[PDB]
Amino acid sequence: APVRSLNCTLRDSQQKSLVMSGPYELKALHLQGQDMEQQVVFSMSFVQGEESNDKIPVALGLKEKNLYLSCVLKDDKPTLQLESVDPKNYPKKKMEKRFVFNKIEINNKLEFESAQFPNWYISTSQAENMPVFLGGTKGGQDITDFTMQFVS
């Protein structure tokens, strides 16, 4: 039948919220109070792909926008982009591989690995107001761990 989706927010393990940074980038910053409303709401779709108890293939669309996080090579590197799609055709169960993340449960958190680029992860910097990016390094300075909130 359809694809199943949940509305949600993400925060990094330093409890930084994700906001828009112009039309095709996200940034992470410490938010609390009134400025909370600025945070991006995702539609997390549960998509076709290799799956285990702790590794769940998802797409991350922006709620009621035809925009998805995607992983592509840019100037020869795996790169996180926001990509526009035909709103008539999305979301769908068989999302193209650039749109798929393996949502992995790790020590009471989540990591989002690129299905396209193994061991590349949605990442944030420790610094405030810097882009969300696709990083190839776990256990370093950059943050690869999240919690998820289920929105109405």
Ligand SMILES: c1n[nH]c(-c2nccs2)n1
């Ligand atoms: C509260 N928010 N997110 C969580 C998680 N527990 C396991 C994976 S993410 N608890």
Ligand SMILES: c1n[nH]c(-c2nccs2)n1
């Ligand atoms: C297992 N995987 N994700 C979870 C969550 N609990 C709270 C938010 S997400 N449990």
